[PDB]
Amino acid sequence: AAHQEFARRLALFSINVYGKLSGQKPGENIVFSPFSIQTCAAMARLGAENETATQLDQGLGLASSDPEQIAHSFHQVLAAYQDSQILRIANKIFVMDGYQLRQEFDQLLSKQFLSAAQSVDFSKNVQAAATINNWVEQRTNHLIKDLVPADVLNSESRLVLVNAIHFKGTWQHQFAKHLTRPDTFHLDGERTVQVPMMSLKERFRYADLPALDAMALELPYKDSDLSMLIVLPNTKTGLPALEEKLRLTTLSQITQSLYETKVALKLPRFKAEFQVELSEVFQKLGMSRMFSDQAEFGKMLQSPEPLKVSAIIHKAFIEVNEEGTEAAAATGMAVRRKEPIEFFADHPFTYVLVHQKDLPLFWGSVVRLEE
Hints:
Layout: H1 2-24, E1 31-32, H2 34-45, H3 50-60, H4 67-82, E2 87-96, H5 103-111, E3 116-120, H6 125-139, E4 157-170, E5 181-186, E6 192-209, E7 214-220, E8 226-233, H7 239-245, H8 251-256, E9 259-268, E10 270-277, H9 279-284, E11 307-320, E12 324-337, E13 341-344, E14 349-355, E15 359-366
Parallel strand pairs: 2-3, 9-13
Antiparallel strand pairs: 1-15, 2-4, 4-12, 5-6, 6-7, 6-9, 7-8, 8-14, 10-11, 11-12, 14-15
Helix pairs in contact: 2-3, 2-4
């Protein structure tokens, strides 16, 4: 249905972005919220026209070229997440003093994307960035700071679109802290580090993935249909090969493979933070016109001023420990006038924080750990 299609399109967008990020920022732990990125960009699409809009439709994987339909489909997902004890999602638009949104854009953002709105003076760009970034902090339990630098805002800025997402869940099956001990995490064939390694024997949904030379495990969050999917290469140095093989399948095909079994799990206690300016990723996914002097965003403002995207920034944070997971992310877009089975995660792996086994909220990799 609608959820499954939305999820499928988002999963493909996710692996698309992940591949470009891995290439742009090699050797570091990736974490991002594809949901946050797709939602923020879809909000911008509502104000786009012509080839600019078509590129966004195709690069984001939207199911319609009709702004009303696109908005309705995001509303279905957002409205579901309003009634949650674990998840909080928030949208807001920040608009230059004296500029008015077009009626349709305004109504779709407010009613379908549940977006708030505030007028700001971008010519006072230090002040405007503080307003934006303080709001993001409030929406992410202070985990995402300084999202939009003052230096990307100026008197030519006209609006900033922001999506924020915050997650705090408890494991259905928590780890016992007294079992956590320093243990070896293999960075590669020449390098290892000692890290706090959590240990738990329990029944989990599991899949052997021989076609991907990997194995997967699902860790559910308590009182929810949310979970963490871990995909673990069979070889210590296998993650780059696995990241390529993932493109040959889908998240839903992976999770459909899972079955409950007794597992001896080892998993590092870890935190990761990641930040990226996404313009190059978008260009590489075929969404270049939005940054150019040919950008078409004539449906955003009543003003006849031509507009383009000057920056897209994403930041994310995740903390995994014995009790559960806390994660957060935000995306800002600035627009301007022109017997047990062993599952030992002791070498690099990829993970996905998923809703209903098929909709990715967060996606990351652990390739290195300190201390």
